Design an enzyme around this catalytic site. Structure first.
Site, PDB file in Angstrom:
ATOM      1  N   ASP A  88       0.845  -1.200   0.000  1.00  0.00           N
ATOM      2  CA  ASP A  88       0.000   0.000   0.000  1.00  0.00           C
ATOM      3  C   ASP A  88       0.880   1.250   0.000  1.00  0.00           C
ATOM      4  O   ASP A  88       0.613   2.204  -0.728  1.00  0.00           O
ATOM      5  CB  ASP A  88      -0.973   0.012   1.187  1.00  0.00           C
ATOM      6  N   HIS A 130      -4.252   8.771   7.167  1.00  0.00           N
ATOM      7  CA  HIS A 130      -4.090   7.433   7.745  1.00  0.00           C
ATOM      8  C   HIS A 130      -2.804   7.136   8.487  1.00  0.00           C
ATOM      9  O   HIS A 130      -2.764   6.170   9.254  1.00  0.00           O
ATOM     10  CB  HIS A 130      -4.248   6.346   6.672  1.00  0.00           C
ATOM     11  N   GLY A 138      -2.355   3.470   3.952  1.00  0.00           N
ATOM     12  CA  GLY A 138      -3.320   4.058   3.040  1.00  0.00           C
ATOM     13  C   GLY A 138      -2.759   5.149   2.143  1.00  0.00           C
ATOM     14  O   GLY A 138      -3.382   6.163   1.909  1.00  0.00           O
ATOM     15  N   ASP A 165     -13.113  13.476   3.067  1.00  0.00           N
ATOM     16  CA  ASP A 165     -12.670  12.323   2.285  1.00  0.00           C
ATOM     17  C   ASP A 165     -13.657  11.142   2.346  1.00  0.00           C
ATOM     18  O   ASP A 165     -14.425  10.983   3.303  1.00  0.00           O
ATOM     19  CB  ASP A 165     -11.302  11.875   2.810  1.00  0.00           C
ATOM     20  N   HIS A 167     -12.741   8.127   2.813  1.00  0.00           N
ATOM     21  CA  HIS A 167     -12.252   7.224   3.858  1.00  0.00           C
ATOM     22  C   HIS A 167     -12.243   7.873   5.247  1.00  0.00           C
ATOM     23  O   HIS A 167     -11.996   9.069   5.378  1.00  0.00           O
ATOM     24  CB  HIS A 167     -10.849   6.746   3.480  1.00  0.00           C
ATOM     25  N   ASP A 254     -12.136  11.866  -3.525  1.00  0.00           N
ATOM     26  CA  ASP A 254     -12.546  10.509  -3.863  1.00  0.00           C
ATOM     27  C   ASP A 254     -14.040  10.214  -3.582  1.00  0.00           C
ATOM     28  O   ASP A 254     -14.494   9.085  -3.752  1.00  0.00           O
ATOM     29  CB  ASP A 254     -11.589   9.439  -3.296  1.00  0.00           C
ATOM     30  N   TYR A 293      -8.807  10.025  -7.426  1.00  0.00           N
ATOM     31  CA  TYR A 293      -8.084   9.114  -8.325  1.00  0.00           C
ATOM     32  C   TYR A 293      -8.542   9.193  -9.768  1.00  0.00           C
ATOM     33  O   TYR A 293      -7.982   8.517 -10.617  1.00  0.00           O
ATOM     34  CB  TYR A 293      -8.145   7.692  -7.767  1.00  0.00           C
TER      35      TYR A 293
HETATM   36  C1  LIG Z   1     -11.144  -3.709   6.497  1.00  0.00           C
HETATM   37  O1  LIG Z   1     -10.566  -2.661   5.704  1.00  0.00           O
HETATM   38  C2  LIG Z   1      -9.199  -2.658   5.753  1.00  0.00           C
HETATM   39  C3  LIG Z   1      -8.498  -2.364   6.934  1.00  0.00           C
HETATM   40  C4  LIG Z   1      -7.097  -2.352   6.944  1.00  0.00           C
HETATM   41  C5  LIG Z   1      -6.403  -2.641   5.759  1.00  0.00           C
HETATM   42  N1  LIG Z   1      -5.102  -2.698   5.480  1.00  0.00           N
HETATM   43  C6  LIG Z   1      -4.954  -3.020   4.189  1.00  0.00           C
HETATM   44  C7  LIG Z   1      -3.594  -3.178   3.463  1.00  0.00           C
HETATM   45  C8  LIG Z   1      -6.187  -3.165   3.578  1.00  0.00           C
HETATM   46  C9  LIG Z   1      -6.485  -3.511   2.106  1.00  0.00           C
HETATM   47  C10 LIG Z   1      -7.099  -2.299   1.392  1.00  0.00           C
HETATM   48  O2  LIG Z   1      -8.320  -2.149   1.313  1.00  0.00           O
HETATM   49  N2  LIG Z   1      -6.173  -1.480   0.900  1.00  0.00           N
HETATM   50  C11 LIG Z   1      -6.305  -0.198   0.135  1.00  0.00           C
HETATM   51  C12 LIG Z   1      -6.708   1.011   1.006  1.00  0.00           C
HETATM   52  C13 LIG Z   1      -7.008   2.245   0.129  1.00  0.00           C
HETATM   53  C14 LIG Z   1      -6.332   3.544   0.558  1.00  0.00           C
HETATM   54  C15 LIG Z   1      -7.059   4.786   0.017  1.00  0.00           C
HETATM   55  C16 LIG Z   1      -6.380   6.085   0.450  1.00  0.00           C
HETATM   56  C17 LIG Z   1      -7.348   7.287   0.538  1.00  0.00           C
HETATM   57  O3  LIG Z   1      -7.868   7.804  -0.462  1.00  0.00           O
HETATM   58  N3  LIG Z   1      -7.540   7.733   1.764  1.00  0.00           N
HETATM   59  O4  LIG Z   1      -8.353   8.798   2.025  1.00  0.00           O
HETATM   60  C18 LIG Z   1      -7.040  -0.218  -1.250  1.00  0.00           C
HETATM   61  O5  LIG Z   1      -8.216   0.103  -1.435  1.00  0.00           O
HETATM   62  N4  LIG Z   1      -6.252  -0.532  -2.251  1.00  0.00           N
HETATM   63  C19 LIG Z   1      -6.717  -0.561  -3.650  1.00  0.00           C
HETATM   64  C20 LIG Z   1      -8.060  -1.267  -3.976  1.00  0.00           C
HETATM   65  C21 LIG Z   1      -8.193  -1.102  -5.500  1.00  0.00           C
HETATM   66  C22 LIG Z   1      -9.207  -0.534  -6.299  1.00  0.00           C
HETATM   67  C23 LIG Z   1     -10.457  -0.109  -5.803  1.00  0.00           C
HETATM   68  C24 LIG Z   1     -10.660   0.268  -4.475  1.00  0.00           C
HETATM   69  C25 LIG Z   1     -11.936   0.609  -4.013  1.00  0.00           C
HETATM   70  C26 LIG Z   1     -13.037   0.543  -4.867  1.00  0.00           C
HETATM   71  C27 LIG Z   1     -12.848   0.133  -6.183  1.00  0.00           C
HETATM   72  C28 LIG Z   1     -11.573  -0.199  -6.636  1.00  0.00           C
HETATM   73  N5  LIG Z   1      -8.813  -0.631  -7.586  1.00  0.00           N
HETATM   74  C29 LIG Z   1      -7.585  -1.177  -7.643  1.00  0.00           C
HETATM   75  C30 LIG Z   1      -6.721  -1.462  -8.684  1.00  0.00           C
HETATM   76  C31 LIG Z   1      -5.473  -2.038  -8.432  1.00  0.00           C
HETATM   77  C32 LIG Z   1      -5.045  -2.346  -7.147  1.00  0.00           C
HETATM   78  C33 LIG Z   1      -5.909  -2.056  -6.103  1.00  0.00           C
HETATM   79  C34 LIG Z   1      -7.162  -1.477  -6.356  1.00  0.00           C
HETATM   80  C35 LIG Z   1      -7.108  -2.933   4.584  1.00  0.00           C
HETATM   81  C36 LIG Z   1      -8.501  -2.940   4.578  1.00  0.00           C
HETATM   82  K   LIG Z   2     -13.713  11.211   5.860  1.00  0.00           K
HETATM   83 ZN   LIG Z   3      -9.723   8.661   0.472  1.00  0.00          ZN
END
Ligand SMILES: COc1ccc2[nH]c(C)c(CC(=O)N[C@H](CCCCCC(=O)NO)C(=O)NCCc3c(-c4ccccc4)[nH]c4ccccc34)c2c1
Ligand SMILES: [K+]
Ligand SMILES: [Zn+2]
Ligand SMILES: [K+]
Length: 363
Positions: A88, A130, A138, A165, A167, A254, A293
């Site tokens: 991440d 975060h 995050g 935001d 999140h 977002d 994004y």
């Molecule tokens: C129960 O929820 C939790 C709690 C703790 C967590 N720790 C991690 C690593 C995770 C996994 C996770 O969800 N990781 C990230 C977090 C996003 C950070 C956003 C920062 C922001 O804007 N803050 O304000 C995550 O969502 N990663 C990407 C998901 C994703 C999306 C995506 C995300 C949400 C909705 C639709 C698509 N598209 C992708 C294409 C390629 C690779 C990944 C994706 C996690 C989840």
């Molecule tokens: K918020």
């Molecule tokens: Zn966000």
């Protein structure tokens, strides 16, 4: 007085490196520039944050580790995973200097505010909400919102953090969970499975900070009027209960229709009204960005919101500038909601709002 706009070409290039949002800082600044809004603001070069400034929240072990892994690319170091670095928050080349620039920028904004130089200061590249004291998270290597609040804390006795935001502002909330000098309010998507999994309405803070954290869990599909209704209503109760003397406002784009997170269905007009409502309090206000994004939509949004800060109405036509073609094929500033259902039941919203009124009677 007129707003401070934190900006330099060096700052923008630095912020352009983050792989999750490449060139977004440039796109944001270039659009504001093209509507000539910088001319109505006081441009301020950001100071890079010192170690001791960063240490005001982050542990020295984390900072040192972050600095060490900054030398050259990485993602391989044995200790990186425990410091939240990895997939991440990958530990690429320079990240530490990038982090120190954004923390520095938000600190510079706060200092401007303490000094009476403005009522509103802006850092659209800040808002990384975060990051924990010893942990990236995050996409946040450093919690610049917390650094800003701890800078404001030098003058102000009651600071209100409002986080719009998509999140949960979990890092900022946790940082201040035990104290009543800073109230955090976050409106965010809360659905089991959705990052970071925290911020139910029943999360109110801990210990001496009990009832000085406010969380408004919202479901997919929310559009401008109902969002504003919720936000105005909570904030009304918060202002009356807490009487803040300064505000840090996080405005991650977002939530806006067209974001690949595909969750809320907002336009900049509805966020803009939440913003107008905060600014009618006429308090020292530190404005930050955050997520977003769909890059052109995020620049659309934050350019619009800069317009509202300045009391301006902007031409709907997107002006020619370096990134003009990213606004194709219609080249307008307005964003249209998707035809997606709103999953928020009025009864639950009203439940949430009542729970919050109840909590705030303790403050
Ligand atoms: C129960 O929820 C939790 C709690 C703790 C967590 N720790 C991690 C690593 C995770 C996994 C996770 O969800 N990781 C990230 C977090 C996003 C950070 C956003 C920062 C922001 O804007 N803050 O304000 C995550 O969502 N990663 C990407 C998901 C994703 C999306 C995506 C995300 C949400 C909705 C639709 C698509 N598209 C992708 C294409 C390629 C690779 C990944 C994706 C996690 C989840
Ligand atoms: K918020
Ligand atoms: Zn966000
Ligand atoms: K608190």
């Amino acid at each position: 007085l007129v707003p401070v706009y934190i900006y330099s070409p060096e700052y923008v290039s630095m912020c352009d490196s983050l792989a999750k949002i490449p060139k977004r800082a440039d796109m944001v600044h270039s659009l504001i520039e093209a509507y000539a809004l910088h001319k109505q603001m006081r441009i301020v070069k950001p100071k890079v944050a010192s170690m001791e400034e960063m240490a005001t929240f982050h542990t020295d072990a984390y900072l040192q580790h972050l600095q060490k892994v900054s030398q050259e690319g990485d993602d391989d170091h044995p200790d990186s995973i425990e410091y939240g670095l990895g997939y991440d928050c990958p530990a690429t080349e320079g990240i530490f200097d990038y982090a120190a620039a954004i923390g520095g920028a938000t600190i510079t904004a706060a200092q401007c505010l303490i000094d009476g130089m403005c009522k509103v200061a802006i850092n659209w590249s800040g808002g990384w909400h975060h990051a924990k004291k010893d942990e990236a998270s995050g996409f946040c290597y450093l919690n610049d919102a917390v650094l800003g609040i701890l800078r404001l804390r030098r003058k102000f006795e009651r600071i209100l953090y409002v986080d719009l935001d998509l999140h949960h502002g979990d890092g900022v909330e946790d940082a201040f969970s035990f104290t009543s000098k800073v109230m955090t309010v976050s409106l965010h998507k809360f659905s089991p499975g959705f990052f970071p999994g925290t911020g139910d309405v029943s999360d109110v803070g801990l210990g001496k900070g009990r009832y000085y954290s406010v969380n408004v869990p919202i479901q997919d599909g929310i559009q401008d009027e109902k969002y504003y209704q919720i936000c105005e209503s909570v904030l009304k109760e918060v202002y009356q209960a807490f009487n803040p003397k300064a505000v840090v406002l996080q405005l991650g784009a977002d939530t806006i229709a067209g974001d690949p997170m595909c969750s809320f269905n907002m336009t900049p007009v509805g966020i803009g009204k939440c913003l107008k409502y905060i600014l009618q309090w006429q308090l020292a206000t530190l404005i930050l960005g955050g997520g977003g994004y769909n890059l052109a939509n995020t620049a659309r949004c934050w350019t619009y919101l800069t317009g509202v800060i300045l009391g301006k109405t902007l031409s709907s036509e997107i002006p020619d500038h370096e990134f003009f073609t990213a606004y194709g094929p219609d080249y307008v500033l307005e964003i249209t909601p998707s035809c997606r259902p709103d999953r928020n039941e009025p009864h639950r919203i009203q439940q949430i709002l009542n729970y919050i009124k109840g909590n705030l009677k303790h403050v």
